[PDB]
Structures are given as structure tokens and as C-alpha cells.
Symmetry: C3
Subunit: 160 residues, 3 copies
């Protein structure tokens, strides 16, 4: 039951999000939406992204009863593909450790295996030139989230 593809772009606190607009305008048969972390918003302005932006607070403001919706859940059953550009050293360790403390990491931890989750770490030489990152990126591969160590990402989205 798929027509226009539903892609969900997750954004974290890396200077890379500075470029996030580019990704959106490009990536936009696709049909997108971005979900951010708070710090990520430190690299771009909402207006510079012509799409629906879901944030932590967004989830809780719409829930007041068991009848009410569960944004992170609602978003997980809506995306056909979940791209996370960029994935910071922090969220990597959160995901690596099944830590859902924000709307993003929760969408991920509730993800659908059946659907694809391509990510692309984007830290700094230092943070990257450290161990864990490896023991974690592949530890993350254990769930096969298609790494990507703009452009490259863009094309890679499709690849039907």
C-alpha cells in the first residue's frame, strides 16, 4: 500500500545539520518530514526547512489520554524510510544502548525492521578517531541500519 514514498529525516546536534536544508530541498515521488533533537536546532532555522518538523515537545503536547496518539509511534508506522542525517557521536551511543530519551531516539528504538533505516555518522576527526565509535557503528550494524560514512546520502536514499 505505497504510492508517494514517506521519508523521515532525523537531525541531531552536529555542525552538519548546518547543511540539513540542502538535503530537504533535494530529497523533496518522495514525501518528507524531519524530526530533530533540541541541540540540532542549533544549526538551522525551522523556516529554512519547507516541511513538517516534529520535535520532542510535539509528542507530549498532543497526548493527554490513552486514547490520544503517540507521535513517536505514529511516525514509526508512517515512514517507509528513516534517514538520519547527521547522526552524532551522542545519539549513536544512545541508539547503541537502546536509550530513548527524546522523540528521535524513540522513533528509532520503536522502528520497523521491515523498513530501512539508513544513517550517516558525522562527528569530527577526533571523536571519530576514538574506539567505541567503531565498536558501536558496527554494533549498530548488528541491527543493520545501513551506514554512509550532501550528495552521497541523497542518491543513496532512493536506490529502489
Amino acid at each position: 500500500m505505497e504510492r508517494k514514498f514517506h521519508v523521515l529525516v532525523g537531525v541531531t546536534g552536529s555542525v552538519a545539520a548546518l547543511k540539513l536544508p540542502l538535503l530537504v530541498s533535494k530529497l523533496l515521488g518522495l514525501e518528507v518530514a524531519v524530526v530533530t533533537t533540541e541541540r540540532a536546532k542549533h544549526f538551522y532555522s525551522p523556516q529554512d526547512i519547507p516541511v513538517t518538523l516534529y520535535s520532542d515537545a510535539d509528542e507530549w503536547e498532543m497526548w493527554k489520554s490513552r486514547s490520544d496518539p503517540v507521535l513517536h509511534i505514529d511516525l514509526r508506522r508512517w515512514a517507509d524510510l528513516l534517514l538520519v542525517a547527521p547522526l552524532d557521536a551522542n545519539t549513536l551511543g544512545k541508539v547503541a544502548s537502546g536509550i530513548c530519551d527524546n522523540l528521535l531516539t524513540c522513533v528509532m528504538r520503536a522502528w520497523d525492521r521491515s523498513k530501512p533505516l539508513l544513517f550517516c555518522p558525522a562527528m569530527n576527526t577526533a571523536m571519530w578517531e576514538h574506539p567505541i565509535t567503531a565498536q558501536q557503528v558496527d554494533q549498530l550494524k548488528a541491527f543493520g541500519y545501513v551506514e554512509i560514512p550532501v550528495g552521497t546520502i541523497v542518491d543513496k536514499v532512493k536506490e529502489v
Copy 2:
């Protein structure tokens, strides 16, 4: 030196806490107290729980000098049994990784082996139908915290 049993119920951010009142009114020779996470309080109202509710802020407001008490510590030497109903996918990963960033997870990480800590994960099909949860729940078993994958829990509390 035990008369009336001291049970400590921990509550996290799962819709399950919606039921938390039930547990309390039932579980209440037992003598209880609940310790929550902030988000958990998103599923119940304090008044609907006829017991002392300890929260993060509670710890710090009472400490101003080395002489002063350490709530999370004080609570760890007071409970005979520590039930955590529900344990969310998030706190599981916190506990799994020895992460004490809130009054709950700290009480746990300072726990007494000598005393029992029965817990019961309570996420959603998705979040649960994911890996880590397993590599973690049993990773958590390594410390033997008696899983429980209301009712069932209730009875299980006792079982002298």
C-alpha cells in the same frame, strides 16, 4: 530486623503507569513508597497515589551539606524490596549501562544485592520486537533483577 515490609515502587514513562494507582492500592504487612521519573508523571496524578512520592527534585532540595541526607541512598537502605512497575525501554538501557541521571536509576545503581529487585519491562510490540531489549533484559539478568515479562506482578511481590 524486619517487621512491616518496605517495598519501593519505581515508575517510568510508559503508558503502563496509567495503571500505577491499581498497583499501589493493592500492594498497600507491606508498606510502600513510589519513586518516579519525570515523564512517568505524565500518566498519573500524585493525588491518585495514597503514598509518599519521591521525585528527582526531592533529593537535591534536602541536601546542602555533607552532613545532610542522600535521598537516593536513604531510600536504598530503607527498602526491603524494590519493584519497578513499569520499566521502560529507556530506563532499561540506562540501568543496562550504569547510568544514574535521575533519582530512580540512582536508587537502582546503588541497590543492595542482598535485597530483591523485581522488575517488569513494559514497552510496545515494536520497541520490544527489537534486539537490544533482549541483549539487555538478560544483560540485566546478569545482576539478577527478577524479570516479569496488573496482577501477575502483585502476587509475585510477596512469594516469601
Copy 3:
């Protein structure tokens, strides 16, 4: 290119920071600076430390453009030695899991192998008398951060 040694003292939320001033006044050819966590500041007052104190907020207030500086980065290229006295059970698990959610843990996760990072866990009998702490302290040794399970620390700083 080293003259006066640059030591960076990290402080976390353990009652031990109560003593932090001592360390500073002593440790001060050395030339120091302290980087704290928020909770840590619950055990000492800034004024009681005659040095530049870097805090989370400090990083973000100085960054508004890609041209702008990256405190946690700037601090990582400036320290010759990074001592973390005390390292709480919490930050241990953060570091263990490559979790940079605050200025401290970020400086660490971006650390320079080439430079030394001596730390000294400082929790409580309980929190310490637990497993993970071990599977973690040595898991932390994997990156060789020179444990130290005031005084002892002080001398140990030097040891040219």
C-alpha cells in the same frame, strides 16, 4: 611545543567535588582549568576555585556560526593532561557508552589519545559494590584512561 603544562580538571556530581577546591589550589609549571557538569556544582561554589570554569552553557553561548569556536573542541586541543576528579558512576557509564550529552563528556569523547586522561572513580560503597562498575572501569581501561581507585591523585598528576 610545551612550556607551562595545561591541565584540565573535570568535575561531576559526586560529594567528592566537595573537596575539588583543594585539588585546584594544590595542582595550581602546571596551569589549570576546570570543566564541570551541572550537578557537580552542587558541591562547591565557583568563587572557591581561582581558575577559569567552563560549563555546558559556555560552549553554546559562544557559537553562532560555522566560523565560531567549538569550546569542547578548543579545550581538547589545549589540554596536555585531562584529570577528572571525581568521575561519578553516571559519567562513567556515559563515557563507557560514548555518550556526549554535556561539555565534559564531549571533551572526553573528542579527546586526544596522544595526551593522557587520568581519572578516579569516586562513588559510594554500594554503587561501587555493583557489577557494571567493574565491566566498565576496565571497559574504560580499554582506552587506557589511567584509573586511580585528595593526595594520591595530586602526585599522580605529575609523574613526568
